[PDB]
Structure 1
Amino acid sequence: VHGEEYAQKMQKRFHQTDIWAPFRHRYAYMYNSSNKNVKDYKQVTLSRYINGFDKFNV
């Protein structure tokens, strides 16, 4: 809506286009840079006691 040249100027990040450096707010460190809990805090505190929270990857 603000001009075709404006959009490509705003969506442009790197002069060189042969390097992939995706945007990240932060970088993970724990668990060899991974996530152990991929659930909400309520699911975090309830899945340890209550059944029906884990979908049983088989």
Structure 2
Amino acid sequence: VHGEEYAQKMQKRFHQTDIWAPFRHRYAYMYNSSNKNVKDYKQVTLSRYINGFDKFNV
């Protein structure tokens, strides 16, 4: 709406594009930079005692 040039300038982040640097608010550290609980807090609490939360990835 403000302008195609304005949008292009806003989107551009690096002068040299040969390097990929994804934007991240923070970098994972625990569990070798991974997430053990990919769930909500409620799900994490309940799934340890209630069936149906696990989807049996087989």
TM range (shorter): over 0.9
TM value normalised by structure 1? 0.98
Q: After TM superposition, list the pairs within 5 Å mapping 1:1-58 onto structure 2.
A: 1-58=1-58
- Aligned residue pairs total 58
Q: CA deviation at 1:43?
A: 0.4
Q: How many percent identity over aligned positions?
A: 100
Structure 2 gap ranges (5+): none
- Alignment root-mean-square deviation, CA: 0.4
Render the CA deviation track for 1:1-58: whole Å, top value 9, x for unaligned: 0011100000000000100001000000000000000010000000000001000011
**Is there any run of 5+ residues in structure 1 with no aligned partner, and where?**
none
Counterparts of 2:22 and 2:57, CA distance in 1: 30
Q: Distance in 2 between matches of 1:2 and 1:38?
A: 39
Per the normalisation by structure 2, the TM-score is 0.98
- Structure 2 CA distance, aligned partners of 1:17 and 1:54? 41
**Would you identify which runs of 4 or more consecutive aligned residues in structure 1 move more than 2 Å?**
none
